[PDB]
Every structure is written in C-alpha cells, then in structure tokens.
C-alpha cells in the first residue's frame, strides 16, 4: 500500500562496514544517532544488525566494562544475524505484521543485496493522516 | 479508542535512578535490552529519558573517553525535554506523538510516572484491522 514508494533508500541509511572493529562501530552508531543499523560489506550485501547494546554486552568483564577490547573485536563477532527481511513488495501485509515487533525491516534482493529499509514511522505517518 | 487500557504499567518499565553514574546507566540499558528508558527519582517522579547514544555522545572527545563514565551522573546527560501524557482525553494527540516518539510516558499531576504508551500498541491495532479485511 505504497510502503514501497516510502522505503528509505539504502544510500540514506547509516550502516557499519563488515570487518570494522567495535570501536569504529560505536563511533558510527554515536554520530548517526540511530540505535540499530545494518552491517554491510564493500558490495553492500547485508550481513546483520548492530547496536551499542550488542557491543557493550560483548565487552562485559567480571569487574568492569572492558573497553580496551573494543579494538580487538570485529562487528561480525557481535552483530545480530537472525532478523526478518523483505525480498519483495507483493506481501506488504507481512511488512505491517513485521513492524509490530521490529522498528524497521531490511529489504533485499534475491542475492541478499541491501536495497533499503521500511520503518514504523512510515506507517504511523499514514495512520495519523487518516484520523486528522 | 482503547489506548488507556493498553498502557504498559510502570512496574514493567525498566528505568535508571537519579544520581547514578553513566556506567550504571549503561549496565541497565545493556541488561534490560531497551535502548531508551526513563529516569526516575526515589519518589517515582519522572525526570528524563536516557540512551547509550546520549551517554557516548557526552564523552566523545577529540576518540570516546570511557574513563569519565564514573564521574558523570545520568542527570548530566539525560534528555529533559520530552512530551508526556496527562490524560486520555486527547488520544489523537497520542497517535500524533508516536509518529516521532517510539513511546510517551504517562504521569499524574505531580509528575509521578505511571507507565508508557508505545508505538507497538498502535501497530497491533493496524495489523488487527488488516486481518479483518
Ligand atoms: N535522526 C533522526 N531524525 C528524525 N527522527 C529520528 C532520528 N533518529 C530517531 N528518530 C525517531 O526515533 C525513532 C527510533 O529510532 P531508532 O534509532 O531507535 O530506530 C530506528 C533506526 O534504528 C532505523 N532507522 C531509521 N532511519 C534510519 C537511517 N536513515 N539509517 C539507519 N537506520 C535507520 O529504524 C528504526 C525506526 O525508525 P523510525 O524513523 O520509525 O523511528 C525513529 C524516529 O521516529
Ligand atoms: N523484550 C522485548 N520483547 C518484545 N519486543 C521487544 C523487546 N525489546 C524490544 N522489542 C521490540 O523492539 C522495539 C524497539 O525497542 P526499543 O528498545 O528501541 O524502544 C522501546 C523502548 O525505548 C521503550 N520501551 C518499550 N517497552 C519498554 C520497557 N518495558 N521498559 C523500558 N522501555 C521500554 O519504548 C520503545 C518502543 O517499544 P515498542 O514495544 O513500541 O517497540 C519495541 C519492541 O516491539
């Protein structure tokens, strides 16, 4: 229902490049402001999602949060790999069902090439539009 | 509408307390799994919202300076300008805020924190409507 024409194009999407370390990923997360962003390789294929909580949980020590380890771990060590996806817009009831539990959903082609995202905000804008 | 009945009760909402340091706030954020949560005082008054993004941005030097986490208080970085629900008389205002806020706190007239209203409850009704045709 014209969620297709609303998808946030991949090139406007903040992301972390695969292979980067967690120090770098924290920097990208902090600068862009977004709490969960996708992880891509140099061909812009989607491998996972990353957040600050994923990074911090991975450096929890027995006495302190071991930040010195941020340099040593890479984003693929801690990124989330099981996450829903959209391959086409012929099933946009699925998008809405999905958005109930996921702030955004990645859309990809058959080769898992990252096309962009659909966000809750897109839907809620339309809901507020039909009431007022 | 039924928006009132679907509020998440306060006892189910993770929060950090005033006066703690930024390291404490990170541990709570990381442990509870939510990325933005309220800041309450010892009487359950609502004072702010805090995320890891606010925390890390506050120690972002010229490199991130994690050593200052023990010296900064949550009230030094928490967000203090945010909307709140006082009543459920104007629920189309609640739909309007969810456009730009993943959740909105509801308070009583003394700013005691009573719970939150999340985008998720509106999205469920949307999904329900489409399932009925
Ligand atoms: N820089 C900004 N400008 C304006 N509003 C902002 C904003 N940052 C956050 N918000 C508001 O906060 C909501 C939650 O953002 P969060 O980063 O947790 O979660 C976001 C974020 O993780 C991801 N996302 C959205 N846009 C993105 C982008 N350009 N790049 C990367 N990720 C994005 O999708 C989730 C849902 O986004 P949605 O827009 O529905 O909902 C957003 C948006 O309504
Ligand atoms: N344990 C869990 N079980 C089921 N689903 C989970 C979950 N943790 C996260 N999610 C899903 O992820 C969405 C975004 O969560 P986030 O922590 O960014 O953003 C959350 C968080 O900042 C806050 N929030 C919601 N419930 C909370 C709670 N019990 N305590 C503290 N904050 C909460 O309101 C935002 C919107 O929450 P909403 O439920 O609309 O949307 C949630 C929820 O649908």
Numbering used by the authors:
A (entry chain B): 12 to 143
B (entry chain A): 12 to 73, 75 to 145
From the paper:
These structures reveal that CbpB has tandem CBS domains (CBS1 and CBS2) that interact to form a disk-like head-to-head homodimer.
In the c-di-AMP complex, one U-shaped c-di-AMP molecule is bound to each face of the disk, and the binding modes of the two c-di-AMP molecules are essentially the same. Specific recognition of c-di-AMP is achieved by a large number of hydrogen bonds with both main chains and side chains of CbpB, some of which are mediated by water molecules. The adenine base in the cleft is recognized through hydrogen bonds to its N-1 and N-6 atoms. It is π-stacked against Tyr45 on one face while its other face is flanked by Ile19 and Ile128, thereby forming a narrow pocket for the binding of this base. In contrast, the other adenine base of c-di-AMP has no hydrogen-bonding interactions with CbpB, and it is not flanked by residues from the protein either, except that its N-6 atom is positioned against Tyr45. Overall, the binding mode of c-di-AMP in CbpB defines a new type of nucleotide recognition by CBS domains.
